[model samples]
Target: GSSGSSGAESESFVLDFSQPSADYLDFRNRLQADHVCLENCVLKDKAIAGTVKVQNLAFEKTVKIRMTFDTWKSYTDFPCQYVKDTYAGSDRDTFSFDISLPEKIQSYERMEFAVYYECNGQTYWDSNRGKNYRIIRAELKSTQGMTKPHSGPDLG
Candidate 1:
């Protein structure tokens, strides 16, 4: 029974956000909505890992997700190296993924990120081959300390 200092007691902050308004159907006739949980998170350590959950109000079966981050000064598109190629698909109709902080992140710092995703909708015979696509965008922020938590269902 080794209960020594194995970093097992490290505290992990939870970040969650969900869409607040009715799902928006864009000009393309595809449902579109955005939700940002944990607008600000604090990180006192060098790295952190957590799970990200996304809800598809449009009932999309599959989705393509693109993620990017921004610091206080500059914005950097998240490199695919940190994510898996098969980072798309909704299990039981809900989209989710595991994320790890990028190496560029420094201890005692803050960062912001946004998730963009597109999914297929009901098809129809049209000039574009009857292809329907829906889009969703969400923004999140992380910092070095916890701030006032948002009131909503946990999407962690």
Candidate 2:
């Protein structure tokens, strides 16, 4: 019953952890994320955004993400920034980052990623119990239409 809508509306997407794939839930190793905990992430506006809470015990440290959209063809490393420090710049810190998406994507593409924290020459990773995090893309709202093709003998 509405027609005039803002053009700001873009393609809809989501993190979609609610229905994670089997590869994302199978735990190959024991718990290893003691220094950094990747709380949650989301995908929207043609980009994947996420947040991580890392242990800031050391003065010099870095937090980053290793991700791939393809079948492990390229290991994209996304460096995150510590935006707001914890209580009194305490040991617990929060970081934020995002990975851009391509112009064309699949209906059910499986993307994998992992977050790691490095400090005191030590690296701690949260690989979803060693299998890494994976997700599938689905169309939230779409219109169905038929494709027109020509395969007639009359056309010469």
Q: What is the TM-score of each candidate against the true structure?
A: 0.28, 0.63
Candidate 2 lDDT, tens digit per residue, 93-141? 6688888876655544556788778887988877753466755556554
Which parts of model 1 are misplaced by more than 4 Å? 1-62, 69-92, 107-110, 120-156
lDDT of 1 by residue, 31-112 (tens): 2222211111233343432222333445543332233333335544332112233543333132333345444422335554
The C-alpha lDDT values of all candidates are: 0.32, 0.63
- Number of backbone collisions per candidate: 9, 0
Error of 2 at 106 (Å): 1.4
RMSD of 2: 15.0
Which pairs clash (backbone N, Cα, C closer than 3 Å) in model 2? none
Count of backbone collisions within predicted model 2: 0
Off by over 4 Å in 2: 1-11, 18-33, 85-90, 107-109, 140-156
